[PDB]
């Protein structure tokens, strides 16, 4: 969960700040090792979450939900075209998938640079969030590929059903 | 050592419980009124002078052993206390000199 990930990250960050105050040796090296470990853990979590979202379209795994869809009819001038646009339904599904993925992949970045100072804020992907983890998925690109394939399959099925239902514009147009 | 043919460096002052036995024997002989090897008595007096320093050296050896054991335990953080390890190594080198 997003709140649980945020709480764990905040605890890790408070511990890191305390360690920086502790005046140990090799603080940057330790920060790098901790960041790499956090990256591996987040990657395992992200692969699991992508798989779970794909299944939901079809415990550390997680289980997101789904919204509704734009399905309707009209005869406004006698054009039976489903509302909103089928592109609208595809955009809604893609946005939901992006939000579910970003719920995990958009957790706060490692605050190991709190001990660092001298330059401006470096909030890139891994600077602000854990940006690189989406490419750091341990399962590989197969999970994101499965998500995209599921989106494409749902869209294709929706288009097929919509076409089958909407073949009858000629009845009102003849 | 047992399992390690490398020389396990038990560096310390040239001391043992025999010095404490000599100091106690000198005290007992002084209390009870006996003759003794007065050169050995002077050596025992010097040992009694140096005894607190020997105790400090033994305590330092014990502390260094404890630090080594802590490093062996938390090898997962062994780089994190590298500064303390380097400071201890430098101090130990100065003492060995």
């Amino acid at each position: 969960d997003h709140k649980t990930f945020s709480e764990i990250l905040n605890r890790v960050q408070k511990a890191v700040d305390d360690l920086n105050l502790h005046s140990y040796s090799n603080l940057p090296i330790w920060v790098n090792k901790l960041d790499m470990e956090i990256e591996r853990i987040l990657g395992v979590r992200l692969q699991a979450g992508l798989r779970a979202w794909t299944q939901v379209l079809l415990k550390p795994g997680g289980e997101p939900k789904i919204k509704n869809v734009v399905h309707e009819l009209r005869i406004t001038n006698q054009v039976i075209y489903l509302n909103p646009p089928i592109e609208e339904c595809r955009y809604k599904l893609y946005q939901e998938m992006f939000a579910w993925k970003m719920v995990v992949l958009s957790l706060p970045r490692i605050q190991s640079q709190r001990y660092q100072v001298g330059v401006h804020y470096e909030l890139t992907e891994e600077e602000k969030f854990y940006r690189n983890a989406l490419t750091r998925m341990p399962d590989g690109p197969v999970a994101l590929e499965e998500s995209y394939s599921a989106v494409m399959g749902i869209v294709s099925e929706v288009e097929q059903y919509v076409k089958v239902w909407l073949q009858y514009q000629c009845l009102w147009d003849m | 050592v047992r399992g390690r043919t490398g020389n396990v460096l038990k560096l310390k002052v040239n001391f043992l419980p025999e010095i404490i036995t000599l100091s106690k024997e000198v005290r007992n002989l002084k209390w009870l009124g006996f003759r003794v090897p007065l050169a050995i008595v002077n050596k025992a007096h010097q040992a009694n002078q140096l005894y607190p320093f020997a105790i400090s050296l033994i305590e330092s050896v014990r502390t260094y052993e404890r630090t080594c054991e802590k490093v062996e335990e938390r090898n997962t953080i062994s780089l994190l206390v590298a500064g303390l390890k380097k400071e201890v190594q430098a101090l130990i080198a100065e003492g060995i000199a």
Binding site: S25, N26 | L79, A82, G83, K85, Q89, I92, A93, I96
Partner: peptide
Amino acid sequence: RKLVHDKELAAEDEQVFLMKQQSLLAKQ
């Protein structure tokens, strides 16, 4: 911005400290 390169804080190994000590003991 000179990324990292913070001298790679490290120290001599305990076996390395013992080996340098053995060399000093030969030199002692």
